[PDB]
Amino acid sequence: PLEDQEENTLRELRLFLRDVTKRLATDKRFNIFSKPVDIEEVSDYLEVIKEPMDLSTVITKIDKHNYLTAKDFLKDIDLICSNALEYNPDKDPGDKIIRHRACTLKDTAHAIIAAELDPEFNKLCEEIKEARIKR
């Protein structure tokens, strides 16, 4: 009963997170982040990057109910950006474009959340997370 009301809120959160992710993934600038890095082409990617992340994996994690707060989701967005900056050199413009897109993907995600997510709803999500940890 308590659990069922929690479950409605979390469903509303996932709908929102899916909507945000759809907007990021359909933006052409972020196409390179919409699928895992091809570790066969980018043969040194796993040597350098210990936790790969991308928007299709984020979508999977939403559907698996891994995110109980927007901040949990934003941590994975942040990881996408952090990975891109750790991996891509900063000398040629073709590399710089990827780093620029990574930082812009991060800023966009945070800006959409800050602009659109209801702060009271966010706090309720955080309470549901905390409740489940402690029950």
């Binding site: 390179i32 991996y87 891509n88 050199p89 073709g94 590399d95």
Partner: peptide, 12 residues
């Protein structure tokens, strides 16, 4: 940062 070979060019 920038530790990897890169996504472009001949060696990736």
């Amino acid at each position: 940062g920038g530790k990897g070979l890169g996504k472009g060019g001949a060696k990736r």
